[model samples]
Target chain A: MSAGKTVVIALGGNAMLQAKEKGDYDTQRKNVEIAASEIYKIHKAGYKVVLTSGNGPQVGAIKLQNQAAAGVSPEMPLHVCGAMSQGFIGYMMSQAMDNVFCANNEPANCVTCVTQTLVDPKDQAFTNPTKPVGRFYTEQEAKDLMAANPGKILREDAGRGWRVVVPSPRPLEIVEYGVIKTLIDNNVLVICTNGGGIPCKRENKVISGVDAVIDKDLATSLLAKTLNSDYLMILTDVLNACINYKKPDERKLEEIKLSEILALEKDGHFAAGSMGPKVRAAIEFTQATGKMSIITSLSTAVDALNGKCGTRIIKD
Target chain B: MSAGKTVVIALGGNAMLQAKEKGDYDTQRKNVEIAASEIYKIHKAGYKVVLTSGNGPQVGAIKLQNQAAAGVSPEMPLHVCGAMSQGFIGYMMSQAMDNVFCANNEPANCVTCVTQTLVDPKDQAFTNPTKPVGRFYTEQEAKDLMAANPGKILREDAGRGWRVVVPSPRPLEIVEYGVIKTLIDNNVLVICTNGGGIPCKRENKVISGVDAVIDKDLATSLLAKTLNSDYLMILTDVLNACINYKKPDERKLEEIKLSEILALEKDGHFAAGSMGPKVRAAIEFTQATGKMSIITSLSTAVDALNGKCGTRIIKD
Candidate 1:
């Protein structure tokens, strides 16, 4: 890999909240510390880094906050709340990165962006409403809300309540990739595309926000490709992944090629919710881009990058 | 449920990295974002949150860094490394918390203290290596290191080579709890006794550093008592305490009296490694100064606090 390969990292639920707790601040800070340590190692080895995160719970909370505070103050919509989460989450990341930098005896130059992701208005995910989003609600509450609102959709989150779900279309383009690239080139670490890049679209020669959840993995893969980084790593909850899952005879495949992974995946060895999207993201990344993409745990990511641990979806 | 309650968060694993590589930077930043969201929620509700952390990984990394830079720069011992990790982790947490404050349209003051704890040199734990401290080394490397240094003890961890283990003595007092109390009383959310406070002892008017891990849970309880918080919440990896093991009728306990938990422990219902420490931490916290101790996973900690979930172990 080149010395200054700017990489984009996509963080999953493990990065935000571990299996441990919903509001477990401890895990969040630790995940960041691990991330900081790993990135610092990369930075020390001479690579710029760009960061993005999923905010399913945080955004949900922000929506609730806006709703709860509406009578006290004018409430912001879901899109505006997305902007708010981005501001606060981004700022926290930048400041925290600065702390890690200073502790490791390095200079800190972390910045955040209310990034935009352009998406088409008629994505299939939107119409089909296959991808669930926002906070879940009770069945009765869900029915009432669905009836009360027109052109709005709600779905049950398994055992969790029913709430508004969104399209979750893949990110077409990162509007701030250019700025991110420039900042990364200057060795200024960036925190960007949080809550899936502010979910936007083109209208009247101008971009406007929308209440959609951009697939963070896709957005990050694209961001990494556009940045021309040597690597794009997607971190998630499990230590790694097992293709067949808990089927006793489950398979643990490490360091598989892009084509091989695709063949196995095409054969239905992997489940839909777990390893499928990750493999898809990795495949899409390698097909459109540079070095490789890793889908692994936060704890083992450093080792994964070294090719010594975790699972890597590599270039064919 | 009073505004006077407090949450004690203990960081583990990803929360405790000595260094970073590849995409670790963004990961840490994102972790901070998630952590801030929860902290913000509690702060908005007017409950204080204090943080403690595990520094085994970070301190080990710091020591390694110091050794690597020995000729060019002086080496910092493990104690300094502990202080460093506290500041380092605290940096991200403080910034994250501050940003949440800003987003919530309120002001906040957050500080990280390089805390100290007094431990008895003759403590029985000092002779028994219970704390698996430092990096998990390669088998050969671990053997060589141990052979070369007689003062250290090593333990095998998850097929990873031996890690330098140390005596994690019971926490006696949080030296900076007074200062932390003042800060919290003045309406500042403080990050105190991090990594269970810098391990130390006073001898003949001289303050000396000790090689040990401080029981973070106990430290939190002690701090909670000294600061007089209404509740002491210890967050961990599991959802709730298991009533029975892998039996078909096994169940998770939502609430149990302190004596009942102790009885369960005596009956070997709880494992010594995982649930044992947490149960003991809570037990001591209650017995020491008679405050409630809630031990549960992060995902349901908020719910547990509200009497909706988790194992609440308290005096009957």
Candidate 2:
């Protein structure tokens, strides 16, 4: 990779979950710290880094916090408080990176972008509002609640319960892309687009935040293609999208071209909620800009880029 | 003043307040920028500086925020949130100073200290909890609310309605005094002791938190004295201490000695709720090992120290 070559790492929101069960700070911190260890190899190899992460859990958690504290005091808006979460997670990253830097006795600055990316105002996602948030509710209860508020939200939310649906539209632009680029250009490891830039609704010069989640993979693809990055690495659960997931004869596919990936995606091989978006994002970025893209676990990110592990998608 | 002469600046939290209202990001940035101008003048003129600030309103605001946010999400403790405030304020100071230094083509580092000062657990003040916080309420309402909550708290709180009282204690040791000294020795301008060190309590084996407020002026006195600062400047509403207050004739003292201040305080001339503590702090610091101490407003601080204008409390 060139010294000026930038790689956008789209971290899986699930990757941030607790290792065992508790989801305690220590567990999350340790998990993120491990991710840092893997990312360090990329940084030391002379690649400029811009990180984007899914904050579905973080935003949901803060929103729940806001709702509970409603009467006694006003709760923080999901967007504004999103900046705070970036700070905290950035702080944790700093602490972890600081320790590692200290051990090596080298001085480095870790910067968080708390970025804002733009999504189309009249996209199909907005009309749909299919994003599920918080704890799921029963369909019957959802219907009753929906009926109570006429023309409001409704969803058949997976296992959790009924959840409000909001558009997960495609992003048109990222506001902090330039600054994030500058940070990477300066050889600083940058964490950008936290919680998909706190998704907002804009009208002319005015912006009113709409409650919804921005898909991390889509944003990551946007980042890579916009920044002219050579690699878009989506860190997630398994090494790659394997055919026949969790069966007696499970086989992982590696080094598939973008066209093949799209065909496989069209065949309904990948689950929409799980592997569909990931594969679609990989194809979108790799095919559009003719750059290499890979999706893998944090541990396999560098190796996959090096052609040793992970599912790689390239221009056909 | 000696080349190594040090100055203590007590920044008004109102500085960060916009148009005499809630604390906002833009307002804080501008206020801190202005503050940076003043700080740069002192640093350029050859002085080590330590800044102390009032966070009662901000802390109260934050405490309310935490309480309100509890349950729906995880609301952090007042102390941790206090640290976040310090970071916010500290960044402004650091960034503002850096801008000033950069404009003048100089280099300076501004660090915020999450400090702890030892306070007496057995002090009679602990049972009193007389710290005036946030806003005031009507006399009728205050009395009624005092009746509502029994021995755990007291209500001198005429003007503000029903607020939890925190014990006002003395500072015995500064937890980060040494770290601050090291920073100062390296020519770094340090801002420490915001909101009086988060009020930690230790019984025997285990340590815990207690609801309390530390007098900013007293804490300033102790911080200055511990650091062996040459001057302790307390920025309050008044420029001078008035003798024979609220009578047919009132006189502002130009240059009162430490003994005179102590005497006047003993005569019950200074009200305990406000002026008494300021007077006591000035006398305590000036009479101890320090050379001088003064009470003045924000606009008059620099002039007061220079003897160009503003009131002064000098020891005979």
Candidate 3:
């Protein structure tokens, strides 16, 4: 049996690897080791950790690596790119966790599952690709590349030139939920669903990686609901889910009911690009499992779990 | 029970990252994945794999990262650098193993143990540091750095000004040999002992990381001896163990007994810097445990095991 409650914590990209920086192995590892110490606290607090990560920069880096080595070696598919990223990042995180507990003379057993999130082929996002990937290019450069390769959509991304955008689909199911459950049950800290897991589909009862991106927050919620975890924690750069974020009168909500959150979401309080999906994920998790979802920064995550900080959206 | 025989494969650093290239994630991972496919063939032959690796370039790279980041974050210890490199490389290798078989829809159960190899602090090498690590510096720069830090040995390296050389010691014991045996027996490919394993010493029964390097080949032999594995394969850049290598009458020995090999060693047939320790490890394995040890290039390791290529050292 598990020691106590379980948590599916979704770590944002910046929380692990910073954006607009060269994603060197050492830099990513140091950031993760620091975070690992905090996750160690959650583990010591008698909670089984099922840690997941967002792959904003690392995914793009892998896509570039795939393209650069396309000639000599066989080019990897989009899903494999995510899978590779998942492998290394999870590797770094798991080892760091082991080191921390090993220093404290605790039993350090952590494993990372190269997870696949099953998606329907008919998902609407397949028709409308909006997930930006790879390095940005000038308008002419983007158009020239797009002309060479058909069916690729290049868009002006957040005032950062043109970038290739792929489908951003909601994760339907964690294909390896049973394995994650078994690992956590055995007292092993589990790192899974990286970059929302390698987007995959089932054809003739066999799953294969496909070219697309899955929304990470939704993936965490799906796994949490699947495992029936006691808590779903979405770690962001913000201390709490803010009301009117970045505005002069912006306010942080320490706790809010699901009904009020849903009503505010309907009124368009959150930005479509940033906080919208997180709120949607929190609401979806609470509505489906009738449990609370905590949104907070990495620094205050423990406090958030204790109901002392962060934005807590709970079922009424 | 295991299906059949089991093998402990020690991958050389050059096999994963070349001599002069920057040891980036993409480069190392690509090299590892190609090897993973070949290892899969060995696994298909019903042999369990306990994989280990060397970090000649990676550990040095990690040390540079530590010094560069010393202003903000506390620099990690030398042993922790080995531990971290082991984590990511094993992570990449394990994930590739998972991917290779996942395509065929087979179970790819692989795990990495951040292994600690015990060494006696009284070992003489600790007093005479000889293992070159990190980047080289100018003569004046080296002198200034050494003056600032006492007990750190600096040496002029290959006409590359000066570099710090730590102690390179023989591995006494593998702390997690039982866990490794358990893992491979249950059909999981275990990756451990990177850079000869985070070198540590037992203090009143507790193991702690120490400032030294462990010879990779020697560590592999120790683990194989402890596990009583059927074969020890040291994957290198050379296809065969050459006698009088690169001379006018250089010859590759296809099969040799440990006793004959030891006689050749007395005549100094192998270069002290390269190919010397590998031969010593193979001889030690055969002499101590009466098992076969195969030394060959990574590309020909599987073939070598089948008695088709490369040199094999066996007990008399």
CAPRI-style docking class of model 3 based on DockQ: incorrect
- Candidate number with greatest lDDT: 3
C-alpha RMSD for every candidate:
22.0, 8.7, 8.2
TM-score of 1: 0.48
TM-score, each model?
Answer: 0.48, 0.61, 0.64
Sort all candidates by DockQ, best to worst: 2, 3, 1
Interface RMSD, in order shown: 19.4, 8.5, 8.1
Residue-by-residue lDDT tens digits, candidate 1, A1-316: 2347666777776565555354333445556566666656766766677788877765665555444433432344455456545544553455456566667766445655456678887777667654555456788877887685766768766675686776687688876565466556656666778777667676544445566777777788878888888788887767676776778888786887888887877787665565677777787877777478787776776677778766787776
Candidate 3 lDDT, tens digit per residue, B1-316? Answer: 2676889999886657765554556677778878888888888788888888887666666555555445433455677667655645655666667677676678656656556778988899888887777556789988898888776668887565577788888899886665566566666777778778878786654445677878899999999999999999999887788876778898888877888888998899885556888998988888888989999988887898898888899888
User: What is the C-alpha interface RMSD of model 2?
Assistant: 8.5
**Where is the poorest 10-residue window by lDDT in model 1 chain A?**
A66-75
Candidate 1: list runs displaced more than 4 Å: A24-31, A134-163, B1-316
Tens-digit lDDT track of model 2 for A86-110: 5445444544554455455555456
Q: Is the docking of candidate 1 incorrect, acceptable, medium or high quality?
A: incorrect
Give the number of the best model, judged by DockQ: 2
CA RMSD (A), model 1 = 22.0
